[PDB]
Design a protein around this nucleic acid. Structure first.
Lengths: 158, 125, 226, 116
RNA sequence: UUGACCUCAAAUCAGGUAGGACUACGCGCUGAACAAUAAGCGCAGGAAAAGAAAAUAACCAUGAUUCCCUCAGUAACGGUGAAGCGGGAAAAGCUCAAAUUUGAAAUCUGGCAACAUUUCUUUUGUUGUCCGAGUUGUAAUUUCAAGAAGCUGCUUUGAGUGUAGACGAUCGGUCUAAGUUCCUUGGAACAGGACGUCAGAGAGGGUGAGAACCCCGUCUUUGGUCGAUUGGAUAUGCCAUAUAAAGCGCUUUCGAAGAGUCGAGUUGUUUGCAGCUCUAAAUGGGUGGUCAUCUAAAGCUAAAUAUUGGCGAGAGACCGAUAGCGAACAAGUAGAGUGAUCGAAAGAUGAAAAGAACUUUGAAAAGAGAGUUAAAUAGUACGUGAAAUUGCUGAAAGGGAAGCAUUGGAAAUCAGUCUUACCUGGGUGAGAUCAGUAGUCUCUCGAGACUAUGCA
RNA sequence: UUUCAAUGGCCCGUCUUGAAACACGGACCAAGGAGUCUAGCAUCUAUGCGAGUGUUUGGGUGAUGAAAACCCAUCCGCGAAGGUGGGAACGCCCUUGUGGCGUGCACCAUCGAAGAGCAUAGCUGUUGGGACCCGAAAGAUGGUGAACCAUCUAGUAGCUGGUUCCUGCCGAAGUUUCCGGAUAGCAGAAACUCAGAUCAGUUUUAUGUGUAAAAUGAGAGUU
RNA sequence: UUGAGAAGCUCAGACGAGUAGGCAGGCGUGGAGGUUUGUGACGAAGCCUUGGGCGUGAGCCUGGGUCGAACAGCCUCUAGUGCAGAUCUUGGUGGAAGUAGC
RNA sequence: GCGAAACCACAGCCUGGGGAACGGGCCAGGCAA
RNA sequence: AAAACUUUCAGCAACGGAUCUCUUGGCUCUCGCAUCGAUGAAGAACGCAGCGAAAUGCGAUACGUAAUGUGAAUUGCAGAAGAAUCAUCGAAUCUUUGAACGCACUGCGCCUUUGGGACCAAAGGCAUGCCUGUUUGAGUGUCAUU
């Protein structure tokens, strides 16, 4: 119809074709390797989350969920977790424990500067009157507060 | 039945493809079978035609009479066979054309590229 | 439709009433009408007469409704389906459809509508494990799940009585997908099978029974002489 | 000016396909974020309960989640909604608490300089 | 004076950027007919715009925007004609101005030097130094949802560089089942019969007629394999400027909030917007019902949504050469018009050109022989070749009509022909559904199909 | 089949006109060519359900076209807000039949004061939309060299010309009356109640031409 | 007595103009799902023909001649579906006419 | 020798009467070669 | 009354191009994607093939080269035998014009560089507005300034 469409239909140049149409094929899973391995490539995400023990939506389903077979005083209280209903959820949960196990050393050491910084304060103002040792300014060059001085005292221990 | 949306099932579009195809796409459209004993020797079913390939015509008025392929006439999908000719008015020979899917290849022209093609498709010499 | 830019009697003119895309293409039917038409469609696939009268070559089928065991759902090769079909003597249908593969009449075949042929048996399964890829290449044989039975596949052409080949797992689910006239289908919510105008649909039994023929008055001649 | 709904089955499948790529990108987490329970603001529907936009700041603090992290573990925030009735605070705090019961949190690696 | 700082200029001073095109969707200005309508003009993107309340509401209150459904042809107006509500799709939040870093412009472009880096020798960075920008304010910080500052005691952390594998995304090559067996008609077998084979492949097309099995494919492929190019994660090596930076908490200390704007009179436009006349406030100001809600005059922002254009793709109860596009072809083409503009007609020999050698007549054009072909009742004026219309021949008829209808006749021509079979009699040889008979097969004793054997 | 013989028959369509007269349109043949598509409303019928009803905004799903089919969450729309007699049908009889005794639907009289929709499809009707097809100078915007071009435009019509196959049944009115109309009437189409009931472009009888009560016929009356 | 396509078969009587208009049953075209285990190079569709038939009719079936690749009956679905006119559109073709004439 | 356009339902003896023109078709007539 | 002429019907030949069959075209709906130009786009003109009538293709590297493939054809002929009126495609080439750019619109130049064999030729650039910066100078500046 159009001039631009029609001149290249008559010409001899090949058409810039793209065999892109793959209907009915879903998006292959990347990201978490565990779920990818247990991801059925044919089932829909609502079916696969359910088969894997995961909630696709914590919010109300707005429709009619499939029936494949004929199926027969508290603000202080805390919900004591939810046991995993599938092995695959336990696989995800087990990795969470191991990843936290590696990242367990959250205590930091001290560098040389703050090391001798805390010794100079400690050997002069004891070890208990942290407010008084924050009140001094001759040695408290940076003018730290009592709260941060105690943190350095704890961190220097280990 | 076709299931890919990458393929088409259109008489208009498939014929457009057939007669809009260039030579490097026409060289696969013009293929030929292989003789039964040779077909199993290389374990391949059909190979594209080629000049200087010894073939036997199986269909048409020129059924049975053998020869080679003098030159493959790609722009009309024909095979020119020596000694398979026609007497014109002036006594000359206007060699008739046979389509590549009628003849059968008996003796191939063994090129270096053909040998690789045979072993590429899980075959052997 | 036609090009909106493009009188009716003039050459190179605007034909009367330009075809418009907003024509009514899709037609609404109430669901309870659709379930009735499909419960009826399933019922009429168990009556052998309505199967022959639709053109199905089931003169040697061992039994109607034809049910097989669950092992047909685990088929893998279309040699196997032909192996099974030929031992249930249902292959007459497929050999009928193969011989009925004409070329369409008219300008249809110029429009990706090239070939025609009859409809073969219908295989209703319950689980996909290789049945759908076994039987599919067999000409005519259509495979459709129990839970999504389609009226264009149980009443093709509008005509009742398609030859269905159930499986045991699919047949056992029929009591749950449709329900009963008293209970309700577990899978179709609040759906009860239709209740008929009459119980005994055979009238000649209603009339020629004793309880009526004992009270009718005398009988005249069927044809009165002139 | 006339509109036709021929792409209605096309658009629905495009939406489903758009949900599946989202699930692919974010595997463990749900495709949908949690929403609170609120009541429609009219005499006609006031006895109803539906979803809200997000959890107010009193709903986060009472449940025990800071407002900054809540945006990261998928709990959404509504600075505009407020709690006037305690039953509205109660129905949404327990909604958070049941969510944190089923919430597995993947640890993230953290920079640990040699000094401090 | 010097020379600073301010302005003023120029230079082929280096580094740049703007224009025109497209316009289906999109954002503005503007506009008459017949209506934010066409047009006219201006500006963009893969979407544009809009957008985190100076928003509703009177509720158990909701909570950025956008689209859909309803609310609803409702209210209101006077037929025009909504919005909350509700239900869905999608969701994500934010950055400045107003604070003294003042115990230290901590910020940044450009030149130069090396270091790197690449869709890339074509990209994009860092380090060092020098110069400028900047104190008429560039960073950090804070944005009302708060927050600043002091305090407390718990919880936290990379804008690095590799390697390795897994996963994905896009491009490219590649791996891929079975008849061309017999018989008949035909120019040709792809047909009809027969015997087979494959089938995750009986879509479609080609091939000398309808080809699952001759060819391309198709199915396996929701994939193996080999390459490259990248994306977000994992694993792990190295480097970390952390004396640092956050969240929650407690506050005997604090808390800045956008002006020719809002608002009023007045005049245009179509309620807002625009001009003109004036022109404000600080628990104020806007809007709703003494109350409720909101926090304007600054800024950004995905997805849900649109799409008669562009790059491709798949289909159709669509048209089938006077149709469907104006164009199945040399189609905006010839051609028409000073010009803007306007604008057609036109598809099919055959399987193969085998496209008619040659002889002959003719100045040739062409004709006649002759040839090819299955066919020339396919000869390039080429598929079938209708009607109108014209020429030749044969027939009957034919004093200013014709014309048709009935009834026949005549000429001319077709309809359609059928004693043949039935019954009875005998003989002759038979067979079987029959044996004063013997076996197998499938059914349900006997019902079939048969194989012997005898012919009563 | 052609032709002849005897008997016959004013050109078709439109419009006009009681009718014609007419005036139109018709050189011939082929092809093209005109109540269509849609939203709203009401009616009739068919179907599903029935104090209910409606899956298709959307979500779930659909491996063999996956734009189909199949399934249902939250709303929402539209609905929901007593006696007397005549009576359909039935039973009991009992001189049976005749009728009576009853029970009395729909409904109608009387006195009075035990929801029927919703949705889909069709038909006909109506209102809009380019609105059966064709035809009236336009006008406006914007351009080109008073003229001309392109679009808005499917601008406007009570009017003009045309509007396409067969058979069967019924078949008017052609105008009162008030007042462009609402009536009526004629024709139908449905629902009713009766032939033991009413009638009649009827005729008599007779009372005072009207009225009232015998024959001749027909079943008659309603909404 | 076989006469149950109960939508069938059978019996009896009267009747038959028709515009506007109302009602009903059918014939035909393109395509659509079903079907005829339909037809077709031993000749589909089409076309012509004073061949033969069928129907009141719309229409239909068939013989011959040409012809050469497709097509149809039945049940439903569907619509750009039926022509003698519109000084109708397009193409073709006559008389006028070998005339006006050049 | 080269060669239109207009026009065209179809025609073309009248005599009279034929009521509505009727003559261009109908009936009586003659004519009609 | 026969011929001629006029008329009907049949045979045959012209004429015409309907019908029937299809069909590398149209239309319609859905679907995926984001991509022009001062680094010269869209458009136009002139060129170019062993020969093209249109038509495409291409730009003096002209119906294209490099590179990666495929592996022997182009085809009316020619033509070579890594062939190919082939595919892919990341490298170069890409005539005059056109927002169109030295002034003008054919011509006329300017500047610099390269060179020729002081002058000339070729090449390069020489369009305007605006932005960041550099240099140069000037203002009737403000000072500064003993």
């Amino acid at each position: 119809a159009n001039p631009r469409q029609r001149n290249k239909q008559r010409s001899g140049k090949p058409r810039l074709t793209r065999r892109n149409a793959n209907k009915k094929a879903k998006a292959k899973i990347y990201g978490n390797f565990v779920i990818q391995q247990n991801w059925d490539k044919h089932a829909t995400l609502r079916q696969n989350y359910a088969r894997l023990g995961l909630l696709a939506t914590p919010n109300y389903v707005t429709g009619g969920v499939e029936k494949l077979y004929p199926d027969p005083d508290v603000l202080d209280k805390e919900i004591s977790i939810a046991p995993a209903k599938t092995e695959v959820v336990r696989q995800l949960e087990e990795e969470a424990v191991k990843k936290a196990a590696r990242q367990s050393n959250k205590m930091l050491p001290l560098s040389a500067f703050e090391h001798a910084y805390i010794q100079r304060l400690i050997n002069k103002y004891g070890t208990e009157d942290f407010e008084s040792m924050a009140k001094d300014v001759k040695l408290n060059s940076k003018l730290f507060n009592g709260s941060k001085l105690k943190n350095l005292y704890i961190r220097m221990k280990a | 039945m076709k299931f890919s949306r990458d393929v088409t099932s259109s008489r208009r579009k498939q014929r457009k493809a057939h007669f809009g195809a260039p030579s490097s796409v026409r060289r696969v459209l013009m293929s030929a079978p292989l003789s039964k004993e040779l077909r199993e020797q290389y374990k391949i079913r059909s190979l594209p035609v080629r000049r200087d390939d010894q073939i036997t015509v199986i269909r048409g008025s020129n059924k049975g009479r053998e020869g080679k392929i003098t030159s493959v006439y790609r722009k009309k999908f024909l095979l020119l066979i020596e000694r398979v000719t026609r007497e014109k008015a002036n006594g000359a020979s206007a060699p008739v054309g046979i389509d590549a899917s009628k003849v059968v290849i008996t003796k191939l022209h063994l090129d270096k590229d053909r040998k690789d093609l045979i072993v590429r498709k899980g075959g052997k010499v | 439709a036609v090009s909106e830019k493009a009188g009716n009697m003039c050459r190179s003119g605007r034909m009367f009433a330009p075809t418009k895309t907003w024509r009514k293409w899709h037609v609404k039917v109430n669901q309870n009408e659709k379930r009735y038409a499909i419960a009826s469609a399933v019922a009429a696939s168990g009556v052998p007469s309505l199967l022959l009268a639709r053109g199905h070559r089931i003169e040697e089928i061992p039994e109607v409704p034809l049910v097989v065991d669950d092992a047909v759902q685990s088929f893998q090769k279309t040699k196997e389906a032909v192996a099974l079909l030929k031992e249930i003597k249902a292959y007459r249908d497929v050999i009928k459809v193969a011989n009925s593969r004409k070329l369409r009449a008219g300008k249809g075949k110029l429009r990706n509508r090239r070939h025609v042929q009859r409809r073969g048996p219908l295989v209703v399964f319950n689980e996909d494990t290789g049945i759908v890829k076994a039987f599919r290449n067999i000409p005519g044989v259509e495979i459709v799940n129990v839970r999504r039975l389609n009226l264009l596949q149980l009443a093709p052409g509008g005509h009742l009585g398609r030859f269905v080949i159930w499986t045991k797992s699919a047949f056992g689910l029929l009591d749950s997908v449709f329900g009963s006239t008293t209970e309700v289908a577990q899978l179709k919510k609040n759906y009860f099978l239709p209740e008929n105008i009459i119980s005994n649909a055979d009238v000649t039994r209603l009339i020629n029974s004793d309880e009526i023929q004992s009270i009718v008055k005398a009988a005249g001649p069927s044809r009165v002489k002139r | 000016y006339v509109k036709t709904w021929f792409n209605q089955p096309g658009r629905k499948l495009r939406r489903r396909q758009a949900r599946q790529t989202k699930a692919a990108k974010i595997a463990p987490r749900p495709v949908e974020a949690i929403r609170p329970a609120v009541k429609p603001p009219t005499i006609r529907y006031n006895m109803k309960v539906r979803a809200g936009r997000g959890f107010t700041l009193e709903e986060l603090k009472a449940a025990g989640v800071s407002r900054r992290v809540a945006s990261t573990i998928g709990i959404p925030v509504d600075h505009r909604r407020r709690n006037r009735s305690e039953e509205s605070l109660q129905r949404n705090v327990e909604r958070i608490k049941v969510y944190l019961a089923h919430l597995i949190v993947f640890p993230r690696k953290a920079g640990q300089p040699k000094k401090g």
